[model samples]
Target: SVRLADGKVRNPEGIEVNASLQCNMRCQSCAHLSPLYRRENADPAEIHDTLSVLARSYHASYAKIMGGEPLLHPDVVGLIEAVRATGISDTVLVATNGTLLHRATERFWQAVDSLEISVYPSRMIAPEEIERYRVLAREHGVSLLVNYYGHFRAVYSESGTDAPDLVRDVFDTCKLAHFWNSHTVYDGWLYRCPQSVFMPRQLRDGGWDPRVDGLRIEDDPAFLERLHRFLTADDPLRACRNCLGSVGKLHPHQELPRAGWQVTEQLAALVDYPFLKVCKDDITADDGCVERSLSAPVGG
Candidate 1:
């Protein structure tokens, strides 16, 4: 939950909209399955329509415009403007890998309320480029955030896990689905987590259909209540069987070729990461407990 300056809190800190599924770099075990997707850009019209319906039931602190690399989208400025027009979120943030930060135009900077640049070890941005970004953001009055990723937490198991206990454990400890609220809006459905949006694409024989896992956005009056129940439900998503959630072993960040992107084997035994063991008796407590559990410093 995002706490407002006035001491009010919102259930979902933010909602994510994928501007493009294509990427400039292909990373192994990409949480969004960006490496596996064909080049596809989200239509602004579709997003406006879907987000308009969602605005009736929900208001988030921010709306995240992300993707394999959001900067790769042709009309990202227009996309940001469309998101803002819906009034579903207080801020519109564009999350992108900094490799393409050089591509952002004046309009792009003007349209977004905030900018989050992901700095990966494999493709580090030069200090000069980062400084330029800072100047641009400052000039445009946009909030700037830079995240350095030295390692990546393993996400999906391509063969899929059948162990019910393991699946539940992963789901319960998942920060993305629970603590961080990485709720994703795609097509015409709102997914509880981003993995649910791409699991079906990777696990063709896993028999998990996205339609069953996500809530469809519509004009029905009952939709709001259903959306709340869907988000708050304790049950793990069917896609959880294929996901390691946030408990998977940490691996040094590296770029993988298209063929090597999927995780063919099951994850090794859980590492002694502090966040992995946070689900105790109070696991069912509010997001605050989970947030505290994840406060531990993460390293290789």
Candidate 2:
């Protein structure tokens, strides 16, 4: 798995590790997975060992405690400790809600190099909560960032049911640039992003895309090269020029007002999942993660 001295992600020291999806909030505009997927809640010991294998075999330099919400993982602290015990990556961090910091300790903070908090805006943790998290970071030599992690837009649904797919060709029309990542949580197989883990449901329902099977991680130079062009495009928001999720010719992803796709919303309602209702909501989220999601089976 290590292309260099050793690694999978994008690390000079090693690889980049993106765990699984296990969140506490039903964030608006979230992507990369259909709402049906939750984090891998298997045996913590097994997960710990797998992470170790990945770190060693892949030569990972930095490992991220990703989500749904890494903090939501029952074994998160233990997982961090396991990674640290390996001494594989000097930089170990958790992408958390900051809401759970109250349960963390100085040692936990010490183990982390940083904490990326996804600010939910209106409903973001109370100011006092932020202060508590800040204090924890300072105490442990950890850094922080706004990360507004998931998509931060409001959506409405009329029928609360199925919707239409937007023009795929209009995808890259954004005026602003965005960064994205695919978190692969192996339930026995590698997936493109974290959301793919929940795909068994969608796949059973026949939502799989064969083209994506070949989708793999990218190198830094390749990512940067593509990002530069995406960011500096003359005008990427042609179709979405009037919308918030607009890229150039790509149809702008309507937000705040445009009704969310009625169909997808209905599906989400059925199983309490937040799969992409591209018909209604902005598919892009704040975390810089984006993906066009489709329906997955219930409880996937």
Candidate 3:
């Protein structure tokens, strides 16, 4: 447990607010399930209230404001202000695709300390606009961080087995556990992991009514203690059953619109054909290729 000078124990880092699930870009394998995720935008008033409680209850070093693309939101500047208003976070970060940076007002840039712009292959806007965004950042006293391109490879887990020994092995060295293993409040629920916040719905796409896991931020009285334990616990998260842990397998996602592709047979077989249309026998074909490693291995 992390003990503070005030004697309160909390694990706080990578604390982020998923403002919405609506994004502009379309990547083949959006680990966030953004393509298939129904549109959900957090109300500013509701978000302000949530952050208000968090600022008073817990201690966090940094706070990130992100979503399908935070810049796409109408009142994104207000959202950024809400995070900074907490006064608990030393730095308030906003990550976006730079699609709408041209539309951002000075107030939006003023509220953000560091603006990370992740460029993806199938980005909506051109590079010229992105360069303009860099200029805008410098003018507004915002630290402009840029990544040429970002890729989210597919990570799908099929096993329903809850082998504690095996699960613990993967949990121990899992990189996701090291960063963002816990401390996220999505749609008002306090989740130990980002996956726990949305994987339940993905499982439902596979036809099972998995329990909606994690403690509620406002409703759970023992929220702080439970959050501390969740971040430090050696046990593998329930979301890991359908996750690839921290292991990486790089496969470029096909460029297409949101929900443009169908589930591949290989992935469908693993998760029992979650999608309505499952592509069979065409593993490497780009139409909608979701492959599976024959010898499924857990992380070290």
Candidate 4:
């Protein structure tokens, strides 16, 4: 649950639906591991079924549809409709890199409630492209959010850190996992964060296990309780050892060459920072713990 400063509480930001795992751009240290994914798109029916079950126990402010690039999916509009029909979220937001805005059809504009474009410094959106989307969004009653990404935070390490304290510290201070709660629903599994969904694929040599990092979305009667426990648990995920979370040092946004995108110990040394010292204030203030009453494990 997310508590606002005003004392109102709501579900976490929302579920992120990966429309496609493959990307058009190869960003360095991509949190989603998009550069490594071999062109895969999600099925709308599976998403619908997954969301239907999740909706029973949770209601989100929005359902975010994203990917390597959402526009790469052939049935993205259908996916939008499927998510909307589930009533799992109040709105449907499609997040993209804006390079594929040209691929959006009238159906796409009509189905999505919002469009979030991430404009990377390496491939900035032209004014004409922005204006075109502005016009389309207004015409379709879609909310438009354009984020200009000047820098990217380093996320992964090819050779994972062996220090348990560092892993716990990273997990505890991760704004994406704890503050923003970027819960992801992928391939019938619900992950605490998007990175957990792909870390296994990206770091096969790291002994990272996907089963330990996510909850399988199923029709079992105890699923809701399990989900509640999973979401509120303070334990660090297995992937946290390799991930820097949100505390990674920032780097100017740039595309990585295909041959050099993977984060080796050499790359990690260049971008990684002492996150504990950097986030000392936030860590001291919160330590990623909610009230024990709110975090009590279900069916224990």
Candidate 5:
């Protein structure tokens, strides 16, 4: 019953289009983990329509495609070309489960800009298996972004997802805990991110719709508001909180440990640009608990 103007809408990170809920494989910790191609998935026309408006509204340069497995879609390659025709050329990337990519048609590889591969040592045949394809990608001029979440576990316990296959200090030494958010449309209403939002199955209001109004970045008042609400609204530990071994990790930008002080002090100076807010009273070591002071929210 709420309209877009009623509440604030913050600009989103980049639109993540689940295109089709069909995925090639089912992993344990996958947030949207769905099964293989379904006869009835989100319609291509509506998906593009919604994405086009969002792209213009948010000044979106890049659009992401991830699904049950985006590559598995019949017209997956053609879809990328169609989206590219819109001319928002910042980056067009896809997240793949790694197996189906093995079967990515030649056109699919040629049309994509970035391909983020999810590493499941358990499921992945071998780097050697895709070695020739890697060459194909380089030759076809595609960027291959390899992410090894092999060490990421849904359970840290004895029978966790990261047990015998996981080597000590291999993944621990290299940890990337960054999280991504998803959004779903129900009826005509849009939820913050896909995790907290979904259509009530069988109800028209619970299905996906891509015909949302286009948003103009600078002219849109609710841009920043929506962004904040989506980020802070719900706790992520609900579905993913089942601490088996280590449920997940956060990106450096997403989480920073006790390493502070010099980092904060250096960040305060220079009245020029990049700083979100300004310093109130000249903060210094002699001034007091600079750590606690600098750590507070930027706005008063």
Candidate 6:
């Protein structure tokens, strides 16, 4: 159950479907950490069965299709079809960066109930291209949405913020826990928050504990009951120790797009911020090399 500001309580409604973790762009401060994130697309069959299993265990208001880049996946059409086939969620939505909108055909537009084009302020979109997407959506009777996540901001726990009780308080006010619901099925696991599915993967040396990583949707047959409890638990996650919730109220700051002079400037400015560093010099660099950059504090 989720508690609202007006003092009402109700069940969480929505679900998020991340069909892939691979993206074509590496924006700075991407919550997905799209830069460090490995390019991996879920198998069509794997995702189809994952959604089928979720439809059986839980009811949702709507389903969202997203990824590193949903448009890049070869079987995204089939993926959308699977969600529509389940008859589980009322609406099936797709999100994309708009770079690949040209690749989307009439069939692609027809498959999704609606499509959201996420345009970063740092990235430019030509007028004709934007109009092109509108035409496609209008032709297919799909609603088109455009959103902007412009600039970099930090939102993780820091020094003196690790008290267990404080972490619990932060978790309580967290929008992700209560407001967004953000039910997610990723790589065969069902999670209440999208971060629960992917954040632990960023940790090194198997440093992530299972308690911090949400439960796996496995076949002991008691999963639904367990998932229900897990979703509604008053207690914060072990991962919550590392998150700064809404009650914490740290403001998200702005950043220049991660580019030549901007990259150098961003590093110099954040040299002492005391979280993982953001790097974009080598888009092709392995996570190991990326970790090496984070290992050495900048401006030391």
TM-score of each: 0.88, 0.55, 0.75, 0.87, 0.53, 0.73
The positional error of residue 282 in candidate 1, measured at the CA in angstroms, is 9.1
> Which run of 10 residues does model 3 get worst, by summed lDDT?
291-300
State model 6's lDDT. 0.58
- Tens-digit lDDT string for candidate 5 (205-270): 342232231112222555455544433443232212112112123111111122220111111121
Go through the candidates in order and give the C-alpha RMSD of each one to the true structure: 5.8, 11.9, 9.5, 8.0, 15.9, 11.7
Query: Best to worst by TM-score, what's the order?
Result: 1, 4, 3, 6, 2, 5
Error of 4 at 113 (Å): 0.5
**Model 5 ranges off by over 4 Å:** 1-13, 35-40, 87-89, 151-191, 198-300
lDDT of 5 at 299: 23
lDDT (10s digit) by residue, model 4, range 1-300: 554222222465777889999999998768898988888999999889988987776667889999788899999999899999998888898989899888778988988888888887777788787888888888888888777666777888777777787787778788777877888888778888988878766775655568789988775777766777777789888888788887776677778865767776632453345555656556433322111211111121
Q: How far out, in Å, is residue 14 in model 3?
A: 2.4
**lDDT of all predictions:** 0.77, 0.42, 0.58, 0.77, 0.41, 0.58
TM-score computed on alpha carbons, candidate 1:
0.88
lDDT of 1 by residue, 37-70 (tens): 8889999988998999888778787899998898
Candidate scoring better on lDDT of 1 and 5: 1
Off by over 4 Å in 3: 1-12, 124-128, 157-166, 180-182, 204-212, 218-223, 258-300
TM-score preference between candidates 1 and 3, better one: 1
User: In model 6, where do residues sit more than 4 Å from their true spots?
Assistant: 1-13, 157-161, 209-212, 218-221, 246-300
Badly placed stretches (over 4 Å) of model 4 are 3-10, 204-206, 266-278, 283-300
Clashing pairs in 1: none
